[PDB]
Write a protein that binds this ligand. Structure first.
Ligand SMILES: *[P@](=O)(CCCCCC)OCCCCCCCC
Ligand SMILES: *[P@](=O)(CCCCCC)OCCCCCCCC
Ligand SMILES: *[P@](=O)(CCCCCC)OCCCCCCCC
Ligand SMILES: *[P@](=O)(CCCCCC)OCCCCCCCC
Lengths: 402, 402, 402, 402, 107
């Protein structure tokens, strides 16, 4: 009976047993870094398998990962820091800060560049951006003529892509729907990044470093991996049929190793388990860690609320693959998902459980009812491939023994 | 880190920084007085800019302001003091106390003085007056033939206007709707004033002074500004295009300096930040301050409930500009607004947050979940012009650090 | 500052001031006995005016009153004592215990004795009787051909009326509606009385005396007023136009002084303020007073729940004068009304506030949120005449000062 | 101290008085074993009447009973132990673990073996099995052509019946409805048994013994009654009209005494009151008893939630005799019923009250609001016959005196 | 109607002024019946179609037809039309005119 903070460590050992038996030994994932904490105390930390298969290098605690969309909560906090200085209000039109967006219209029909559009019921608000109710979309969605336009203009990334270019190009594109009336995962968070720059006078990497990473002691989180740390950078793998994987990004000669001009508020960051733990633990503590504060306790409680109309779940409003059964009983606040109904989600957990993931199968959650949190790192695109984040939840909630 | 009552004072300093940067330095407001308190302790008090631009006089803590519609909560408390003595019941017809109102009818069509009307489903009740569900209106609404009548009869104020005249004139006017069936901001609170007089035997200035202002130590709150205090009286300014302002009321030769015969339960009062703080803090304490009680703890808890049908928000029942997005997730009790849904309001705060404002951009709130309150004084007509009350909420809730 | 149990006694003195000014001095009521208690402590007890106008006798604390329908909670407790011994279940058909009621049918049309009827969806249950969803009615309702039948058969009372006769006569009468589908105030509680007899083997006066009155020290509560105590018995008065009253029952030569054979579970009891206080205080304590228990804490919590379908209020299901505005936001359990929505009721009080009244303007309530209770005795038929029970609530809740 | 753990033992004595008066003396039941516990303390334990009428043998505390469907919670816990090791997820298709079930279809019309079927909206999930939303059924339901097929194939039990045979036969049978769209009591739990075997590598009797019975000190719980304990085994009786009973299973020469090849996760177990108390008390403690843990506290809290769509009760989704009035205000989790609305159920108790029963009138419940639990053993088929489980609840909740 | 002597949508109280303030039965027994305001006055078309809210003594369903029977408004000694009209002026209607149908003395 090893018990720390009401958690049986013997039960937590099933994490490593499970990742070995189900993913690593059968060659579905290259390697995992898994951290669990409760009541401020780290109770599990376990590197397993390889960060680089080709170079036979193991995952270590200090291994760097593409956290991709786990950037979105950091960008969300950055912008909400400025909400707390009265620099904007959530119900303000975006076109107040981006005047060229005043006349954005809703897609009716046509192909880029001759798309016909209709008037929106109301202009897009900052709250719409923070909650993906903008009516913006993502190139990779591959559902509509609008995301076809995003792909032909490389608005997800590509040579000479800047935030200045994203904002300039989106001014001339239609929205998937009248702002507020639906939910669709979007570049909206990359735009929030642009608004941090606009309001702070700083470049996004500088705002993050000054106002989040330095205060919290996150020295290994950056848009561009410094040359001296590139040895610690994991390879990224993508799914291959037969539950296998292939090389997707070599850490040597990775775009993440160059400073191209694109600071992606949506997917740009590289981090390690320790750095993301400090960010998570700060949020779990109401915005403060070791005497550094990144956000007001109340402002954070506001971000963790469901901001979807009529306390609806994602499938009640989502047009995308976030319509599907895994997101049942989950809502969405200002940059986090929020568990609304545990039974409906078919996954053990608590009402209020908040977090997000990255397209490379990175995941984190904060159960505010249990003061419990997990950070899970691996590099397998896409995150939709395996239900590993759900198995980990089963095991972890399984290890509660008070 | 200065922390008083779980509030970072360094974070509260963003209030002054914000009002300077956004309103004062750019010449949108003349001057501000801002007070914040929590758990009985004043944690912020800051005069800024000028009370009188023309005479180059600064705002001081003791500066007197037209609080306009922040009178309504005081008139509400006055009447509810009499509820507690069994002097009436909320479900009683108004025409019990004002017999000439027995045959009030609902506007169908026509112009003053030949307006056709229909029978109401039921007579107007006291609760209707206290909640603006009377079907009365305001001259300044400028929406209907009925408020056109209010303007031609100067029922908002003007030469030889008394409450006796308001009551006499309203007896011959139609209502905007069958009482209870909708909400419309109204002279109803001026009528509550008349009912305080009717039931107490006292003139409203005397009831207020005896039963509210003296007990609470509010020596600088009155319908008429005494000659010896007129030096402290701020000028009132109105909005001019280009986010500028012009002189609206000179404190020397102001109708607020004369005792004309009109005691406005709806907008009549002049007060200072300290006096309104004592009134607010009394409410925050459940009706008692420094051993003086103006209202029962339970009676007040009743006034702070949502009194709108089916726990609806103002936009679900309001016919006016209180229909609009800023009042989403806000209800209405007996003289206070009540926050119902924080996420829906798109503004940080707590469920139960109650208060009201004045047309000159004066505002106060009491967050009963956080034991937190704000009093904000400025003189810019109309209150709808800037979202300053929302920015202050963002910053203040931002400064909570427990 | 006299304060007992968080109640300002100076504020409670407004009770006597109010009853004098509004009812006694203007000759609307003959006399009042008013008791208030909180946290087990009696904080107000006040006789006022006359128990007998004709004989110029004052109301004293020991004065006996017709509590009429305040019997119903006592009969409810009696039956639920037997629920706790497993003697029946609430969802059981009544015709299990009263076999002659197996074929009760619903009124379609016609006059007694040729009434046509329809099959009910389901048989009447014990829970239907305890909640007035039986589809039974009362002679005095004066709305339907069915209550016309009750009057011609004198089922409310009259010479040689017994419970045995009520049960025998109701077997041959139609119901106002299919049991469960509506609410209508009824002899159902008189029938509950009959079921106490049926299941206990005892006459109702004996069950009450043995299992309620003796345990609780209620020596002055009985269906028949002993000759020796008839000096203490108040006269009953009925309303006369001009807000006046006339003699309705002379205490000398009162049917309440004779032992006719009718033990009315619905309206039969005579009691004093002290006895009803002990009954009320027992309920307020979870069924125990001074080491005597009349009901389990849990069983009582069950009786105080709203037992109306879909947590509806009385006006959502009532066909009677309990449809009207005063009963808005009030439900009904097993013999008590239950406040559901305070704001909707337009009267100060707490969610869960339970109690009932008698047709002679007797009233009691228990606010379980405030551990507060009131017993009000007067003798003015009918209870619908004046809103005094609401004025008392205003004043009493007004006197809470913690 | 006639009070243990806030329960009056004098009031609990009404249990024996009631079972004697209502069931035993009138010969409706042969014998009862009744245990009640609160806050970890057993406050009532009472054998009454005979375990074997023919052999005139009394019920003793150590008497063994057919608990029938009270097996289902044990099988549920067994499977959820494996959920906690990440061995599966609730939203996974069953056909992942039982590939021959990929093409299960929904009954349209026809008789076995020529039944026509339609495509289901989605494949059956593990959660569907644990909640009886599978669309599987039971032979004994006697409502549909589908259960007629179950009977002709003896899928409830009979010679040469194994779990391997149940799974093989169900692969070729239609479902009553598209999985998830309704509720119907089923062999689904017997299938959960098969999945425990599939995932654990162990036979179900071994998994139970190793992972539940040995840890909890339940030496007298087994699928097959050991020869040396067969003297303690009660006879089973079935209902006969006139509220009488006949011999149904002689304990000598009982199929429960032989090891036929059928390990019934649904109804197979024989147990005693002490063993089932230890299992119940473990659950009441959050999955731990005397330092042995069978399930995580959080995992169990998940199983006790209502898992029916839109927090509906059983009658809102059940097609069976679980449609009927007794199951009003009761939902269903992963192997337990859950009380949702106390008033609606017409039975005293608490929201969250969970448990289940056996077809032989065995019953248990755990009131997590009162830390109270009951185990009731008798042998009368079917459980639907008498409302004894409701009478016991009335009496027990009646005995709460804090 | 064909001589233009009236219109169907005209209030009855135009031709029977004592009927201007007819009210709808809420509760009570003759002679102390409580009533509510009708949405609109009774029209001639209401009479011709039995949507008046009048009733018949013999209906034997409501306190209102009990009143018709005790006043013998279906017939009986010294009954005239003048008496029917005079007595109905002081009685409540079963419902707000137009809102339902009930066979009646309307004809
Ligand atoms: P982000 O990683 C998309 C980043 C921009 C990519 C441009 C090509 O979204 C991934 C979705 C994962 C959400 C939750 C997944 C649980 C592990
Ligand atoms: P009151 O100030 C109107 C007073 C009577 C004026 C007669 C000409 O209403 C102003 C509305 C402000 C409500 C909330 C505003 C937030 C600052
Ligand atoms: P009970 O007094 C009727 C007793 C049977 C009378 C048979 C002629 O009902 C009276 C209704 C009062 C309920 C609440 C009133 C508040 C004071
Ligand atoms: P289980 O006992 C059916 C076991 C399989 C038998 C195959 C012939 O279900 C019985 C239903 C009882 C549920 C609740 C009853 C309360 C005592």
């Amino acid at each position: 009976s090893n018990i720390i903070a009401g958690m049986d460590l013997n039960r937590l050992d099933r994490i490593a047993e499970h990742l070995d038996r189900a993913y690593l030994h059968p060659g579905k994932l290259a390697g995992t870094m898994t951290l669990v904490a409760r009541r401020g105390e780290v109770v599990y930390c376990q590197a397993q398998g390889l960060r680089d298969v080709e170079r036979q290098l193991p995952v270590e605690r200090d291994t760097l990962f593409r956290i991709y969309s786990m950037t979105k909560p950091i960008t969300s906090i950055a912008l909400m820091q400025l909400y707390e200085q009265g620099r904007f209000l959530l119900d303000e039109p975006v076109h107040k800060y981006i005047p060229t967006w005043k006349n954005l219209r809703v897609y009716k029909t046509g192909s880029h560049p001759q798309m016909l559009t209709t008037a929106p019921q109301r202009p897009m608000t900052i709250r719409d951006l923070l909650t993906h109710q903008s009516g913006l979309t993502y190139g990779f969605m591959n559902r509509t003529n609008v995301d076809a336009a995003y792909r032909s203009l490389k608005l997800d990334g590509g040579p000479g892509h800047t935030l200045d270019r994203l904002i300039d190009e989106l001014a001339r594109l239609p929205l998937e729907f009248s702002p507020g009336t639906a939910w669709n995962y979007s570049v909206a968070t990359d735009v929030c990044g642009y608004l941090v720059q606009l309001l702070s006078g700083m470049s996004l990497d500088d705002y993050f470093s000054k106002h989040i990473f330095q205060p919290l002691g996150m020295p290994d989180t950056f848009f561009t991996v410094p040359a001296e740390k590139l040895s610690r950078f994991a390879a990224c793998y993508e799914y291959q049929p037969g539950d296998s994987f292939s090389l997707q990004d070599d850490p040597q000669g990775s775009a993440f190793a160059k400073a191209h001009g694109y600071l992606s508020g949506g997917g740009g960051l590289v981090s390690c388990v320790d750095d993301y733990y400090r960010f998570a633990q700060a949020l779990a503590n109401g915005g403060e860690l070791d005497g550094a504060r990144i956000i007001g306790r109340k402002t954070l409680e506001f971000m963790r609320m469901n901001h979807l109309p009529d306390n609806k779940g994602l499938p009640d409003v989502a047009i995308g693959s976030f319509s599907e059964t895994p997101y049942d009983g989950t809502g969405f606040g200002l940059g986090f998902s929020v568990k609304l109904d545990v039974a409906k989600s078919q996954t053990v957990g608590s009402v209020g459980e908040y977090g997000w993931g990255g397209m490379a199968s990175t995941n984190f959650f904060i159960d505010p009812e249990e003061d419990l949190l997990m950070v899970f790192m691996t590099q397998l695109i896409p995150s939709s491939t395996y239900a590993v984040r759900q198995e980990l939840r089963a095991i972890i909630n399984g290890a509660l023994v008070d």
